[PDB]
């Protein structure tokens, strides 16, 4: 099988300037034909991808006048003249000359946007929860760069460990930022030992960290 | 228009088969070669093969030949793909695609169906409001959400307002607990001023254990 090897892995780049991301083949991909089949396409997270570049120069129809295809032999290049908060995703090359059809690995594009600290936010276990044994509390940080946030739970000012879990987003096409949700998650007797429920975050975009906290029972 | 309708998320058991569906609309399904594509973390993107929907031959990648079986009924638009004696390693998510100018481009795609191959059963979700409350205000804005806890397998979808509100919607990518579940989180920030006249509802599915609930997040007087 022919293999598809992009350069570089991974990209961040300020809006307005250049991206560019190479493609090469293992072997000639010229179909039987005399055409080469080599695409380009953008995947976004839980999305199918999306076609931007094909027979390694013609634009798809829709696609931005920004995006350009070019290469011969083994070596094809994807050329963004000045990337936007919409380019983020990973690019993928593809080439249909010879079957099977082979996908190269992927190249992650970052948007390197200005510095934006988190809004924070708290929510206590609900009622529906407690009914149930377990209590679950939610810390939201909100829409900040880089994606570099840290929390950390405290319970009555003791520092926790091991009783949380979080997640962060995909860098958002609109904004460029990211959210992180952090969860702490006891028992409803451990959670009823406790009376002051903090997370703190700490950021590049933050002088001094950010504590968002609540008393239980008090609602 | 031309749309690509695939089957929901399933979980099975190791050596059992799934039958994959994408239902075809919008243009003549006999006019364009049908395509499976395969998306599994570190084999990464791979093409599987295409079906001839007028004589209903597959050239298949020898990789999937066997292990995958193409079919086609053109009485309902509908291509199939069937995975038989199913391992671990098939897990991963299938798409179905076509390519409407020869054989240049592949133009429409389906949304993907995500094939879990596991011993453990199924589990559904629990789902948890995340009320908007004077904790979870910043300037003028409410943050609210939804918490979908100890579900198995993935995936799990989340809609606001049955897909009305989509503007600030964070659904964060699931977690995997010691218990071998997930859980995963929906949130949303909405002006505060009007949480008395604004009605959020999220809408969680999770195919695999044909879970579909609806739950209102009531503001907290708090
Ligand atoms: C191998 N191949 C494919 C695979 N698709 C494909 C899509 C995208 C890509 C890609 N991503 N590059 C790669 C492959 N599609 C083909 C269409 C024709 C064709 O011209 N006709 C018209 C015949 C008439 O005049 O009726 C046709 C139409 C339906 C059935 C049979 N033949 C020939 C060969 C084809």
């Known amino acids: 099988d022919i293999v598809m090897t992009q350069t570089p892995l991974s990209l961040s780049v300020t809006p307005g300037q250049p991206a560019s991301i190479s493609c090469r083949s293992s072997?000639?991909?010229?179909?039987?034909?005399?055409?080469?089949?080599l695409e380009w396409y953008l995947q976004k997270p839980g999305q199918s991808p999306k076609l931007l570049i094909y027979?390694?120069?013609y634009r798809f129809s829709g696609v931005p006048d920004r995006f350009s295809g070019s290469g011969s032999g083994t070596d094809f290049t994807l050329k963004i003249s000045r990337v936007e908060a919409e380019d983020v995703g990973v690019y993928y090359c593809?080439?249909?000359?010879?079957?099977?059809?082979?996908f190269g690995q992927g190249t992650k594009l970052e948007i390197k946007r200005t510095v934006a600290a988190p809004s924070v936010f708290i929510f206590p276990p609900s009622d529906e929860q407690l009914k149930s044994g377990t209590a679950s509390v939610v810390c939201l940080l909100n829409n900040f760069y880089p994606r570099e946030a840290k929390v950390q739970w405290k319970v009555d000012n003791a520092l926790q460990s091991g009783n949380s879990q979080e997640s962060v987003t995909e860098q958002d096409s609109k904004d460029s930022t990211y959210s992180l949700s952090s969860t702490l998650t006891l028992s409803k007797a451990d959670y009823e030992k406790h009376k002051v429920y903090a997370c703190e975050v700490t950021h590049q975009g933050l002088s001094s960290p950010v504590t968002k906290s609540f008393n239980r029972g008090e609602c | 228009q031309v749309q690509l309708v695939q089957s929901g998320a399933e979980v099975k058991k190791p050596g059992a088969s799934v039958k994959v569906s994408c239902k075809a609309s919008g243009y003549t399904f006999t006019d364009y070669y049908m395509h499976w594509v395969r998306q599994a973390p570190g084999q990464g993107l791979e093409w599987m093969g295409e079906?001839?929907?007028?004589?209903?031959?597959?050239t298949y990648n020898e990789k999937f030949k066997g292990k995958a079986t193409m079919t086609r009924d053109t009485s309902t638009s509908t291509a199939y793909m069937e995975l038989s004696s199913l391992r671990s390693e098939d897990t991963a998510v299938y798409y179905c695609?076509?390519?409407?100018?020869?054989?240049?481009?592949?133009?429409?795609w389906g949304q993907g169906t995500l094939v879990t191959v596991s011993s453990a059963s199924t589990k559904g979700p629990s789902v948890f409001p995340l009320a908007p409350s004077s904790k979870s205000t910043s300037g003028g804005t409410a943050a609210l959400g939804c918490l979908v806890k100890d579900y198995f397998p993935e995936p799990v979808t989340v809609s606001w307002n049955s897909g009305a509100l989509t503007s600030g919607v964070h659904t964060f990518p699931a977690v995997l607990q010691s218990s071998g579940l997930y859980s995963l989180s929906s949130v949303v920030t909405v002006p505060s001023s009007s949480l008395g006249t604004q009605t959020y509802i999220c809408n969680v599915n999770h195919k695999p254990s044909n879970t579909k609930v609806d739950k209102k997040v009531e503001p907290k007087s708090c």
């Open positions: 593809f080439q249909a000359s010879h079957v099977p059809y082979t």
């Open positions: 695609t076509i390519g409407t100018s020869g054989y240049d481009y592949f133009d429409y």
């Open positions: 072997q000639s991909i010229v179909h039987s034909d005399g055409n080469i089949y």
């Open positions: 079906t001839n929907p007028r004589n209903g031959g597959t």
């Open positions: 027979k390694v120069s």
